[PDB]
């Protein structure tokens, strides 16, 4: 679950960011949920020091997503705290 966290440690108030999620359509939250297990699984593989090609290839093999698309998003959510990653995926360009 994107449970609901300890809204305690943050120089920025997310109510605005999470209000956006609450008002987002079901399809948008659903899309973010689909991309959340792929980005999270990739982090575990990089932690084990697996080659990026093999790490992304394995993820692209198990998940039907573009390896190039997932890599761009993985670095983009790096600056965002993991708990807000679900909200960051809602905000697409």
From Swiss-Prot:
Disulfide bond entries: none
Induction per the UniProt record: Expressed in the early phase of the viral replicative cycle. Expression of early genes is repressed by viral Repc (latency) and favored by viral Ner protein.
Localisation: Host cytoplasm
Region (1-beta, viral genome ends binding): 2-93
Domain of life of the native organism: Viruses
Free-text note on domains in this protein's UniProt record: The catalytic domain contains two distinct activities, the cleavage and strand transfer activity and the flaps endonuclease activity. The N-terminal HTH Mu-type domain 1-alpha is responsible for sequence-specific DNA binding to the IAS. Two adjacent regions 1-beta and 1-gamma bind to the ends of the viral genome. Contains a D-x(n)-D-x(35)-E motif, named for the conserved glutamic acid and aspartic acid residues and the invariant 35 amino acid spacing between the second and third acidic residues. These residues coordinate the metal ions required for nucleophile activation. Each acidic residue of the D,D(35)E motif is independently essential for the 3'-processing and strand transfer activities.
Subunit structure: Homotetramer. Part of the transpososome complex composed of a DDE-recombinase A tetramer synapsing the ends of the viral genome and the enhancer element. Interacts with target DNA activator B; this interaction brings DDE-recombinase A to the transposition target site. Interacts with host ClpX; this interaction remodels the transpososome for replication and is required for the flaps endonuclease activity of DDE-recombinase A.
Family affiliation: Belongs to the mulikevirus repressor c protein family.
Other comments on record: This enzyme is structurally similar to and performs the same endonucleotidic reaction as retroviral integrases, RNase H, RuvC holliday resolvases and RAG proteins.
Physiological role: Responsible for viral genome integration into the host chromosome. During integration of the incoming virus, DDE-recombinase A cleaves both viral DNA ends and the resulting 3'-OH perform a nucleophilic attack of the host DNA. The 5' flanking DNA attached to the ends of the viral genome (flaps) are resected by the DDE-recombinase A endonuclease activity, with the help of host chaperone ClpX. The gaps created in the host chromosome by the viral genome insertion are repaired by the host primary machinery for double-strand break repair. Responsible for replication of the viral genome by replicative transposition. During replicative transposition, DDE-recombinase A is part of the transpososome complex. DDE-recombinase A cleaves the viral DNA and the resulting 3'-OH performs a nucleophilic attack of the host DNA. The 5' flanking DNA is not resected and an intermediary structure is formed. This structure is resolved by target-primed replication leading to two copies of the viral genome (the original one and the copied one).
Protein's name according to its UniProt entry: DDE-recombinase A
Location of this fragment in the whole protein: 77 to 168 of 663
């Amino acid at each position: 679950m994107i449970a609901r966290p300890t809204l305690e440690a943050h120089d920025y108030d997310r109510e605005a960011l999470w209000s956006k999620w609450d008002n987002a359509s079901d399809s948008q939250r659903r899309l973010a949920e689909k991309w959340l297990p792929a980005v999270q699984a990739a982090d575990e593989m990089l932690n084990q020091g697996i080659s990026t090609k093999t790490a992304f290839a394995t993820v692209a093999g198990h998940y039907q997503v573009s390896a190039s698309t997932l890599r761009d998003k993985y670095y983009q959510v790096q600056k965002f705290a993991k708990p807000d990653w679900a909200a960051a995926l809602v905000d697409g360009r």
